[PDB]
Write a protein that binds this ligand. Structure first.
Ligand SMILES: [Zn+2]
Ligand SMILES: [Zn+2]
Ligand SMILES: [Zn+2]
Ligand SMILES: [Zn+2]
Length: 1473
RNA sequence: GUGAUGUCACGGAACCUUUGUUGUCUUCGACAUGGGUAA
RNA sequence: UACCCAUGUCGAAGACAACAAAG
């Protein structure tokens, strides 16, 4: 006789579920199992499989109901209905049977004895306990009994740590499964109640069910009545096929960044010319096309679906890369004033190192655990007493724990669901100034401005909230709620807003019953009614305590460009650039606004370095200290791995919205003087200049106790003063003038910290002498042959501190132009044009200036020559090659079926193919033409010519014989000649012998006559014996070498041979096998057959080759193997053939190697080869072809002169001063600013604006040719030296349209430049910042700058044609004696120069000849002295002046034997004239 | 799928430390092609 | 198997090297 009451539990928060465990561990000795006794449980349908279902025990529900009953009986003085309850019986004989025992105190409401063990009737409380089944609680299950694969199908495990209060660092953690109430809100069950129980027991059960507010860690209401995989495979296959796997990770991070929107697919960058040949997105179908067809797929039209697709694809690519009781309700919103980071790692998401916590539907989550932890920390801070409570046991009774036992906080989420942003973070090596090994990672960051609903309920005996809670909530109201991790980088600062508080008296019977009836107004509907009763504001704490953190505002003025780089954003950005500045997102509504900001991590690192460089502990600078378990200044101010820091830097944002500009850079090879291979690049920094300085303003929070301390204030003041003196540039690429701090100023410190922030020798006369003759013509560039000794002895000083005896400061110099100067703005190529590229001068904010990178390059090139050093930029991997001449050792051969052997054909013959004397093309198969199948062709090696008259009147070896005349036709005689006493009889046709045929004109058929026969070399083969000469043909089997009609001459202007062509010029045929000879270059003798044609693309073609080859007499016994060196040389030859700008525009006239893009040597190939012993030296595909050098170009140079590899071989003085990849340089080159209004070379069109200038056209600036200075493969030829262009006044001649060498004209072209030049007399002032420079280093830098009276520099564009001669005068030197004191060093300059020259004497005692050579290359022409300098022309027939061209110079003056000495002796003429 | 006269698990901040940075003159002249002739 | 040269056009580089998380 029982009745069933059905119950339902609805969860308002994600609830906690336990990990499944077998019955062997379900005991009292397992910590993990007993920890989850208050959580939901997971069942197994079978023990082996994880397929199961979540359930809630009836025991947990019963315990919660009993606790609520205790509370209700306490609030009603033990009275339920008209009966009084007993104090309750909680006393068990067998303590062991109880899995757990109560460790909280039991509420007490009466002094009576508990009910008797055996009694006729029991109080309602005892009936509810179960002493009077009577009331049985059944397990609650999901409705419908659904099955799930496993716990991870319904929930995700999360880590919850425990943080020490004093240190701020965690020391332990535990995990639990969180199941979202959105997916699984309701659990249903039943309670079986016996009919004999009293009505008061049922009333108490109902009241306790309605009073139970939490269960399984969540607030609850109890009521009783393929494509991504395929895309990844395709992308990986495309990368594998094209050998572009090194771009995989960059493609994994970029594609992942596409998860924000599919619109980014159309916004992907293109090539530099606007075409779809981007080096990343057009690798292939292409990757861009794959992403395009994935974007508009019907499946991925939803934003969430596209985000999931992008995340899965990025992950796949990354893996490929490897009594009195009151309740106060406070409702408001927590708003993020900074980015925040609640850490939670997904094990299946390995692409991001640091991740934020999200809901299953990708909403940002403000967890309840973090809010409780922050509340406890803030209360402990308020009380100034840490809670020394250990886990487990009876509850702690401190002031904090008492407050926390009445506190309930709702877990919160946000409507905003955009994916988090990814930030790059690194750690710098203090000694090298570069990044440390392995210190590169990325962090997920949630945007600022996200709003979370916030509800806090406090249940306690006080009238309202305690004073501690009031003060903590007022701290949070002032925006000092630091909730999340990564606080030192200014993350996780919230402000509580729209706060309302209301107290409900649960002691009142009416209020208690109202609370019970409405379930405490904790559900979504109940909160709506409750919030109407809430009153705005917060209680004012009587004993209010000030917040522990104080805000200090920083304002930085930088008169220079700035960049905080982000390469992935650039890889995705619409405008193709190598790197772009960092941009963050802030949340507005459901949208994200991107803004440019200086990362808080970078500013924190710079400030920390500034503090550490000037301070040292116990004789050791703070940087060198291990910073483990120490009390040093750096750990006190900034924290360490042991404890949290007392300072927190926020992101500094730039005022206004400065849009970034694009600066191009190219590395200049020190040998060739031109662009180094692959070293062309872009940068997109924020533009800054003295005209419009960047203003970077932000805040950082410092703890009050530090701001009170005098020593910390003094340390921060000295560091910020050194930053204020420009000692610490912000951002990257400061070596080229970026991010120079003009001024720093802090506010809000009450002046505690800011109180600390507050004749040059004449150029020496030169000794250099250069004699110039007006007749002589000199070369544009010469080479300084360097001294063999490059000093690697010194070790580079670290950037960790300033050193005694070393000089730090700034050099202000005046750079003067002595000739026109050209520095182009290459972002736009149409400044002087309405194609022919035309560049404006370099201007920043419409101010003419020289970027620091060009000045740095020029000064570094001079410095590498003053002190002998390595060639810092040099393409060592280049392989030189030359063309053969018509002058033997190459022999025919066929590559065997193995592929590692080539046999040797004994003989070759010329088989006419493209003339009208045979039908070989018709009577040969494709396989025979290709050389696959052997063919039988008659060959003749000697033809016979005869004279009727005995040799006279003009052979040297003739055999006389009897000619029997057969016939005469076509004007040519025909007779069978029998000679060698009848041994050899052959039929031959004969041309009329001049002055001889007339004597014997009489034609007798069957005659006998006297003749003399000679043999001539006629090495030709035909498949069928020709009818004219059916004698002396030997049938031989061999292979046909057919490379096509390759020997061709293509001219824009009509050549002599094609001009005399009679008829109409035919079209170029598509099939190269149909090409037939149409004319003869020597028509008189019917030789040199030629095929002439004309086309629009290539103008006139003249193909003079009519014979293919026939390889016969193969030597199968003889073979030669192919070394890998020969194979790589042949591959280089093939790539040079295929990558040929000057190739003929018709592929029919190209060889089979070039017209069919032969990428490798394969089996069956017929080639020429030269060999040594049993291995092949060189292989060529045609008769006259390319010769490839065996060694790299860098081998032609001494190893001491090669670029330093770091990993410290050591460092040269110039590499030491300017830095390498592993060592940061100690010099920073700022932008030179033009002092006055510019005197220009050419005034522009409009006289209204005088600052702008007019166009001028340079001649063709062509690629430097290393093969000229290096005449060939001989080891005698070396790298002559470092190229330095001489000073000359060809700019005057080329100011008109006069070519430098010729002067005929300079017409526009699609391959030349137009520029505006700063005429001579322009004055710039610039500053070079240096740190830790020796005396001789400063002296030699000054010498490199000033040079001597009579010298100059060359800077900018078109140095060969007289442009860019500039001079530098050192104006002033400021030296950093101390952080507070600076003194001038103009009196110390002579000592600097003397010590530098003494160091030069030490290094090179009397071998300073290079200096003089450099000096002669730096010598500037005196008055009444104008040398003439120009490159030669191709040939003398192209030069009106009559000077010898390159073809006439390679033999003669600049012959291979003496070209190097001519080019290594400065100012050496190449034309006497 | 929990036992039952005793479960503070709202008893526990995934927390602390790290500079997207180092190096690079928007520069610049001789090369490309393969045969033809031996009346 | 031994000589002989003939033709006059043409852009190149477009990022590279390193770190890809540790304590
Ligand atoms: Zn009782
Ligand atoms: Zn406590
Ligand atoms: Zn320390
Ligand atoms: Zn070096």
């Amino acid at each position: 006789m029982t009745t069933t009451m059905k119950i339902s539990i609805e969860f308002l928060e994600p609830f906690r579920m336990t990990k499944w465990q077998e019955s062997t561990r379900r005991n009292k000795n397992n910590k993990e199992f007993v920890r989850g006794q208050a959580f939901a449980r997971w069942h197994r349908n079978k023990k082996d499989n994880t397929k199961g279902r979540p359930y809630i025990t009836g025991t947990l529900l019963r315990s919660a109901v009993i606790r609520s009953a205790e509370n209700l009986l306490t609030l009603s003085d033990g009275k339920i209905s008209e009966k009084t309850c007993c104090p309750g019986k909680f006393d068990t004989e067998d303590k062991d049977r109880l899995l757990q025992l109560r460790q909280r105190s039991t509420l007490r409401w009466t002094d009576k004895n508990p009910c008797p063990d055996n009694a006729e009737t029991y109080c309602p409380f005892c009936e509810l306990l179960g002493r009077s089944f009577r009331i049985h609680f059944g397990n609650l299950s999901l409705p419908g009994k659904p099955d799930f694969d496993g716990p991870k199908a319904i929930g995700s495990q999360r880590v919850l740590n425990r943080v020490d209060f004093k240190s701020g660092k965690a020391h332990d953690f535990f995990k639990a499964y969180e199941v979202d109430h959105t997916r699984f809100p309701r659990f249903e069950g039943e309670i079986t109640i016996d009919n004999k129980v009293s009505a008061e027991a049922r009333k108490l059960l109902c009241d306790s069910l309605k009073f139970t507010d939490r269960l399984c860690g969540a607030l609850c209401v109890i009521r009783f009545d393929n494509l991504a995989e395929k895309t990844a495979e395709q992308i990986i296959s495309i990368l594998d096929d094209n050998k572009k796997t090194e771009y995989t990770r960059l493609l994994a991070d970029a594609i992942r960044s596409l998860r924000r929107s599919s619109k980014l697919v159309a916004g992907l960058p293109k090539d530099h010319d606007g075409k779809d040949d981007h080096y990343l997105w057009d690798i292939g179908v292409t990757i861009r096309q794959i992403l395009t067809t994935s974007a508009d797929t019907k499946e991925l039209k939803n934003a969430g679906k596209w985000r999931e697709f992008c995340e899965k694809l990025g992950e796949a690519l990354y893996l490929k890369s490897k009594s009195v009781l009151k309740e106060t309700v406070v409702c408001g919103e927590l708003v993020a004033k900074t980015p925040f980071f609640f850490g939670a790692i997904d094990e299946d998401a390995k692409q991001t190192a640091l991740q934020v916590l999200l809901t299953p539907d990708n909403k940002y989550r403000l967890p309840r655990s973090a809010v409780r932890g922050i509340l406890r920390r803030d209360l402990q801070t308020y009380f100034d007493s840490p809670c020394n409570a250990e886990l487990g046991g009876r509850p702690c009774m401190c002031k904090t724990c008492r407050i926390m036992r009445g506190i309930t906080v709702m877990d919160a989420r946000s409507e905003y669901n955009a994916p988090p942003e990814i930030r790059h973070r690194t750690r710098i090596n203090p000694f090298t100034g570069t990044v440390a090994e392995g210190a590169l990672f990325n962090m997920e960051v949630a945007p600022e401005g996200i709003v979370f609903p916030f509800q806090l309920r406090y249940r306690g005996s006080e009238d309202g909230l305690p004073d501690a809670l009031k003060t903590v909530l007022k701290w949070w109201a002032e925006g000092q709620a630091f909730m999340s991790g990564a606080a030192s980088t200014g993350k996780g600062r919230f402000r509580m807003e729209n706060a309302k508080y209301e107290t409900l008296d649960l002691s009142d019977e009416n209020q208690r019953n109202d609370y019970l009836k409405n379930w405490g107004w904790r559900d979504e509907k109940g909160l709506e009614e409750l919030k109407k009763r809430l009153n705005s504001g917060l209680p004012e704490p009587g004993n209010y305590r000030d917040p522990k953190w104080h805000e200090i505002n920083v304002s930085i003025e930088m008169a220079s460009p700035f960049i905080n780089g982000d390469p992935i954003r650039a890889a995705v950005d619409k405008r193709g650039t190598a790197v772009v500045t960092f941009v963050k997102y802030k949340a507005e509504g459901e949208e994200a606004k991107p803004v440019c900001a200086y990362k808080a991590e970078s500013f924190r690192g710079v400030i920390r370095s500034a503090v550490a460089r000037i301070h040292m502990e116990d004789g050791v600078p703070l940087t060198e200290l291990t910073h483990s378990d120490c009390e040093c200044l750096l750990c006190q101010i900034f924290g360490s791995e042991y404890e949290a820091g007392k300072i927190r830097f926020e992101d500094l944002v730039f005022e206004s919205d400065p849009e970034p500009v694009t600066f191009d850079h190219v590395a200049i090879d020190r040998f060739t003087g031109g662009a180094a291979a692959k070293k062309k690049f872009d940068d997109s920094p924020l533009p800054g200049s003295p005209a419009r300085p960047l203003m970077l303003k932000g805040s950082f929070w410092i703890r009050r106790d530090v701001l009170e301390d005098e020593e910390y204030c003094k340390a921060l003041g000295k560091a910020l003063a050194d930053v204020n003196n420009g000692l610490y540039p912000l951002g990257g690429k400061s070596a080229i003038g970026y991010g120079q701090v003009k001024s720093l100023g802090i506010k809000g410190d009450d002046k505690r910290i800011s109180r600390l922030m507050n004749a040059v020798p004449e150029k020496p006369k030169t000794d250099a002498e250069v004699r110039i003759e007006a007749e002589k013509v000199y070369y544009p560039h010469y080479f300084v042959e360097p001294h063999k000794k490059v000093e690697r002895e010194e070790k580079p000083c670290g950037h960790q501190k300033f050193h005694e005896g070393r000089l730090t400061g700034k050099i202000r110099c005046k750079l003067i132009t002595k000739t026109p100067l050209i520095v182009p703005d290459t972002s736009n190529d149409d400044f002087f044009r309405p194609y022919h590229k035309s560049y404006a001068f370099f201007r920043l904010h419409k101010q003419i200036m020289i970027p620091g990178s060009e000045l740095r390059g020029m000064v570094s090139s001079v410095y590498e020559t003053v002190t002998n050093s390595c060639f810092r930029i040099f393409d060592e991997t280049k392989r030189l090659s030359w063309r053969m001449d018509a002058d033997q050792d190459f022999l025919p051969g066929r590559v065997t079926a193995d592929g590692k052997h080539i046999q040797k054909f004994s003989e070759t013959a010329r088989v006419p193919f493209y003339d009208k004397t045979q039908k070989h093309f018709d009577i040969l198969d494709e396989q025979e033409i290709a050389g696959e199948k052997p063919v039988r062709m008659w060959v003749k090696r000697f033809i016979k010519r005869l004279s009727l008259v005995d040799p006279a009147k003009h052979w040297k070896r003739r055999k006389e014989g009897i000619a029997t005349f057969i016939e005469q036709k076509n004007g040519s005689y025909y007779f069978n000649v029998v000679t060698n006493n009848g041994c050899t009889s052959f039929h031959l046709w004969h041309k009329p012998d001049n002055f001889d045929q007339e004597k014997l004109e009489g034609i007798q058929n069957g005659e006998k006559l006297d003749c003399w026969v000679r043999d001539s070399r006629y090495q030709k083969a035909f498949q069928e014996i020709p009818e004219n000469d059916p004698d002396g043909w030997e049938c031989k089997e061999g292979y046909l070498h057919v490379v096509g009609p390759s020997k061709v001459e293509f001219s824009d202007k009509k050549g002599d041979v094609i001009n005399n062509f009679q008829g109409t010029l035919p079209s170029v045929p598509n099939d190269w096998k149909t090409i037939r000879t149409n004319d003869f270059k020597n028509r008189k003798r019917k030789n040199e057959p030629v095929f002439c044609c004309e086309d629009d693309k290539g103008n006139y073609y003249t193909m003079a080759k009519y014979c293919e080859t026939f390889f016969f007499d193969l030597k199968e016994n003889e073979e030669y193997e192919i070394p890998e060196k020969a194979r790589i040389k042949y591959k280089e030859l093939l790539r040079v053939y295929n990558n040929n700008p000057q190739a003929v525009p018709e592929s029919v006239f190209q060889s089979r190697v070039a017209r069919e893009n032969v990428e490798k040597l394969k089996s069956g190939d017929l080639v020429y080869f030269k060999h040594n012993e049993k291995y092949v030296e060189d292989i060529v595909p045609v008769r006259i072809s390319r010769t490839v050098d065996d060694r790299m170009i860098g081998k032609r140079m001494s190893a001491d002169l090669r670029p330093c590899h770091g990993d410290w071989k050591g460092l040269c003085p110039a590499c030491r001063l300017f830095g390498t990849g592993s060592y940061k340089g100690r010099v920073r080159f700022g932008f030179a600013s033009l002092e006055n209004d510019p005197e220009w070379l050419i005034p522009g069109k409009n006289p209204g604006d005088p600052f702008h200038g007019g166009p001028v056209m340079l001649s063709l600036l062509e690629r430097p040719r290393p093969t000229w200075s290096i005449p060939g493969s001989d080891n005698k030829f070396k790298v002559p030296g470092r190229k330095f262009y001489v000073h000359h006044h060809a700019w005057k001649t080329i100011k008109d349209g006069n070519h430098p060498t010729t002067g005929k004209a300079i017409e526009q072209s699609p391959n030349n430049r137009t520029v505006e030049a700063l005429a001579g007399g322009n004055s710039f002032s610039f500053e070079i910042a240096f740190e830790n420079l020796k005396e001789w280093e400063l002296g030699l830098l000054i010498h490199s700058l000033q040079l001597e009276k009579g010298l100059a520099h060359k800077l900018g564009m078109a140095k060969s044609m007289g442009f860019g001669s500039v001079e530098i005068d050192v104006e002033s030197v400021r030296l950093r004696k101390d952080w507070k004191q600076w003194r001038n060093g103009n009196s110390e300059i002579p000592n600097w120069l003397g010590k530098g020259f003494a160091k030069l004497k030490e290094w090179f005692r009397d071998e300073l000849d290079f200096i003089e050579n450099l000096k002669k290359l730096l010598w500037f022409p005196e008055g009444d002295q104008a040398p003439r300098v120009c490159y030669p022309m191709l040939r003398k027939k192209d030069d009106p002046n009559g000077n010898s061209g390159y073809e006439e110079l390679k033999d003669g003056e600049f012959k291979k034997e003496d070209r190097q000495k001519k080019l290594t002796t400065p100012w050496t003429p190449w034309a006497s004239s």
